C-alpha cells in the first residue's frame, strides 16, 4: 500500500511508523534523518575589498602656475598649492620664490588582496531543502539522499518515496547576506554605488576582476610645510582594515533553533523546526501474510522496573505463546511511550523483553504484537541527574495525562454537595406544592 507519514524536523531520534495493509502483516518501519539543510538562492551583488591609494610623484612648478587636467578617475583629487618651497642637499630644488607652486594629485584603487581576500555582499531569497535519511528496512540500515520539496521521487529496493514539502517556510537568512571566507553575517549592506565614506561599504566592484571600482574616500590634500616635499593627504580609513572587531558573531552562534552554517556553498544544516510529510509506497514483495505469520496467544506482559528517563528506562518483560517460528513486529499504539526494537524472532511458547521509555509517572498501555493486543501497566521513577547531552524521544506529551493515585485523589476531593442542594430543592418544592400548579 501507499503510506504517508509525518516526522517532526529534529535530528537524532528514530521515528517509527506502522503501515497497516489489511489482509497482511503490520509494517513497523523506521526512519531517521541524519542531516537536513537549506540551499538559499545564489545571487552575488558586489565584491568588496581593501583599497590602496595610488599617489604619483609631486609636480613642483618652479615659479610658474600649474593646473591639473580633470582626468576621470575614482576619487580623483587635485590641488595646486602656491608658495611651496622644497629642500634638498642644495637647499631649494629651483631658483625663484614668488610664483613657486606645486601641482599635487592622487587617486584610489583596489589592491592585490582583492584578488584573494574579500567579502561578498549577496542577495539570497527562498530556498530548497535537501536531506539524507536512514531507514531500518528489514535488517537493512538503508540510507537515501533526496532534495526534499514534495517534487522529487526516488525508488530503491522495492520502495518508492517522495519527501517534502516542508511545513515551515522559515529561513535563517534575510535578503541581505555578507559572506567572508568562512562565515556569514545577516547585515544590511549599503547598495552598490551608494557607499557611505569611511564606514564599511565604500570601495566596491561587481566582478572581482573589474578595471573600474566605485569609492568614497573623502580625500583632502592639505598644505605641505617648508622643505617637506611629500604629499600631505587626508587618510581614508576603509571598513575592511578595522572590520575585525564589530563583527559581533557569525550566524553560527546567532541562529535560532540551532542551525550549523557552512560556506561554499552556504548550507544551513540541521535547521530544526517544523515537520515534514513523507510518502512511502511498497507492494507485496515485503508484505507478509496474516495467516502465514505466527499468531500468538497467552499475552502476559509486565514491567519489573520502569524509570521515566531519557534513555531506555523501562525494560518490559513479556511471556507469550505463539503458533510457529518467524519474525514478529512490535508496535506502541499510544504516544506516551516509545520502543527501540523493530521486530523480534519468535518460535513458540517463549519469553522476550523490550526497552521502552515514557515521560510521566504511571501509565497503563496496550502494545500490538502481530495484530495481537496486550495490555500491561507500569509505575516509574525519575532519574537523579538533571542534565543530559541528547534530546529524548517520548517527551512530547500533553497536560491531561494519566498518572498514579493522583486521579484517585481528584476523584476523592470532588465529592459533591449538589445532592444536598437538591435536598434544598426538595424542601422548596414541598413547600411550594401548596400553590405551585399553574405556571
Amino acid at each position: 500500500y501507499e503510506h504517508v507519514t509525518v516526522i517532526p524536523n529534529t535530528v537524532g531520534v528514530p521515528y517509527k511508523t506502522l503501515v497497516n495493509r489489511p489482509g497482511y502483516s503490520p509494517m513497523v518501519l523506521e526512519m531517521e534523518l541524519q542531516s537536513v539543510t537549506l540551499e538559499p538562492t545564489l545571487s552575488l551583488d558586489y565584491i568588496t575589498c581593501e583599497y590602496k591609494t595610488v599617489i604619483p610623484s609631486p609636480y613642483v612648478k618652479c615659479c610658474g602656475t600649474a593646473e591639473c587636467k580633470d582626468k576621470s578617475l575614482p576619487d580623483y583629487s587635485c590641488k595646486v598649492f602656491t608658495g611651496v618651497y622644497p629642500f634638498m642637499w642644495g637647499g631649494a630644488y629651483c631658483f625663484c620664490d614668488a610664483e613657486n607652486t606645486q601641482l599635487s594629485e592622487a587617486h584610489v584603487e583596489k589592491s592585490e588582496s582583492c584578488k584573494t581576500e574579500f567579502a561578498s555582499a549577496y542577495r539570497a531569497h527562498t530556498a530548497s531543502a535537501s536531506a539524507k535519511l536512514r531507514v531500518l528496512y528489514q535488517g537493512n540500515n538503508i540510507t537515501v539522499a533526496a532534495y526534499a520539496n514534495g517534487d522529487h521521487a526516488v525508488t530503491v529496493k522495492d520502495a518508492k518515496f517522495v519527501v517534502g514539502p516542508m511545513s515551515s517556510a522559515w529561513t535563517p537568512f534575510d535578503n541581505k547576506i555578507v559572506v567572508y571566507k568562512g562565515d556569514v553575517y545577516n547585515m544590511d549592506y549599503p547598495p552598490f554605488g551608494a557607499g557611505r565614506p569611511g564606514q564599511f561599504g565604500d570601495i566596491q566592484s561587481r566582478t572581482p576582476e573589474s578595471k573600474d571600482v566605485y569609492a568614497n574616500t573623502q580625500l583632502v590634500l592639505q598644505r605641505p610645510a617648508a622643505g617637506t616635499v611629500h604629499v600631505p593627504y587626508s587618510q581614508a580609513p576603509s571598513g575592511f582594515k578595522y572590520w575585525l572587531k564589530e563583527r559581533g558573531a557569525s550566524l553560527q552562534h546567532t541562529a535560532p533553533f540551532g542551525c550549523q552554517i557552512a560556506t561554499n556553498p552556504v548550507r544551513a544544516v540541521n535547521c530544526a523546526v517544523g515537520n515534514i510529510p513523507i510518502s512511502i509506497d511498497i507492494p507485496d514483495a515485503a508484505f507478509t501474510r496474516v495467516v502465514d505469520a505466527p499468531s500468538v496467544t497467552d499475552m502476559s506482559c509486565e514491567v519489573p522496573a520502569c524509570t521515566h528517563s531519557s534513555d531506555f528506562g523501562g525494560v518490559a518483560i513479556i511471556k507469550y505463546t505463539a503458533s510457529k517460528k518467524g519474525k514478529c513486529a512490535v508496535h506502541s499504539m499510544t504516544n506516551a511511550v516509545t520502543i527501540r526494537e523493530a521486530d523480534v524472532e519468535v518460535e513458540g511458547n517463549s519469553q522476550l523483553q523490550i526497552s521502552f521509555s515514557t515521560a510521566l509517572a504511571s501509565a497503563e498501555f496496550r502494545v500490538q504484537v502481530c495484530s495481537t493486543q496486550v495490555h500491561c501497566a507500569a509505575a516509574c521513577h525519575p532519574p537523579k541527574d538533571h542534565i543530559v547531552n541528547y534530546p529524548a524521544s517520548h517527551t512530547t506529551l500533553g497536560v491531561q495525562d494519566i498518572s498514579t493515585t493522583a486521579m484517585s485523589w481528584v476523584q476523592k476531593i470532588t465529592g459533591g454537595v449538589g445532592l444536598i442542594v437538591a435536598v434544598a430543592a426538595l424542601i422548596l418544592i414541598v413547600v411550594l406544592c401548596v400553590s405551585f400548579s399553574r405556571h
Binding site: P383, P391, V417, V421
Partner: protein, 104 residues
C-alpha cells in the same frame, strides 16, 4: 539556566557543547505523605500552579454553593412557620430541627 528547549554553549576553538534538561531534583513520591506537587515541579513549575489554585477556587466555590443552599434552606424552613399563629408546630420543627427547636 538551561531552558526547557535546551542549551548550546561554545568555549573557544573547541567544538561546542549541547545540554538538555531532564527530570528534577525530585524530592518526591506518591503516598499518604503526598509529595505529589513536587512532581508538579518538573511538568511546568509556575505554570498550572494556576490550575491547582483555581482548583482550590472551584472547591471553595462548591462549598460557597453549600452556604447558598444552607441559607436558602434555613429561609425556606422558616417559610412554613413564618409566624403561623398557633405557637405550636411539633410536626414542623421536631421533624425539621433547623434552629431553636425549643419553640414548640
Amino acid at each position: 539556566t538551561v531552558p526547557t528547549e535546551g542549551l548550546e554553549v561554545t568555549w573557544g576553538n573547541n567544538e561546542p557543547y549541547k545540554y538538555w534538561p531532564q527530570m528534577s531534583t525530585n524530592g518526591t513520591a506518591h503516598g499518604h505523605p503526598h509529595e505529589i506537587i513536587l512532581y508538579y515541579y518538573e511538568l511546568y513549575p509556575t505554570m498550572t500552579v494556576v490550575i491547582v489554585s483555581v482548583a482550590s477556587f472551584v472547591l471553595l466555590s462548591m462549598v460557597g454553593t453549600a452556604v447558598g443552599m444552607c441559607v436558602c434552606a434555613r429561609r425556606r424552613c422558616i417559610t412554613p412557620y413564618e409566624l403561623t399563629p398557633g405557637a405550636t408546630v411539633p410536626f414542623l420543627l421536631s421533624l425539621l430541627c433547623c434552629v431553636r427547636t425549643t419553640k414548640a
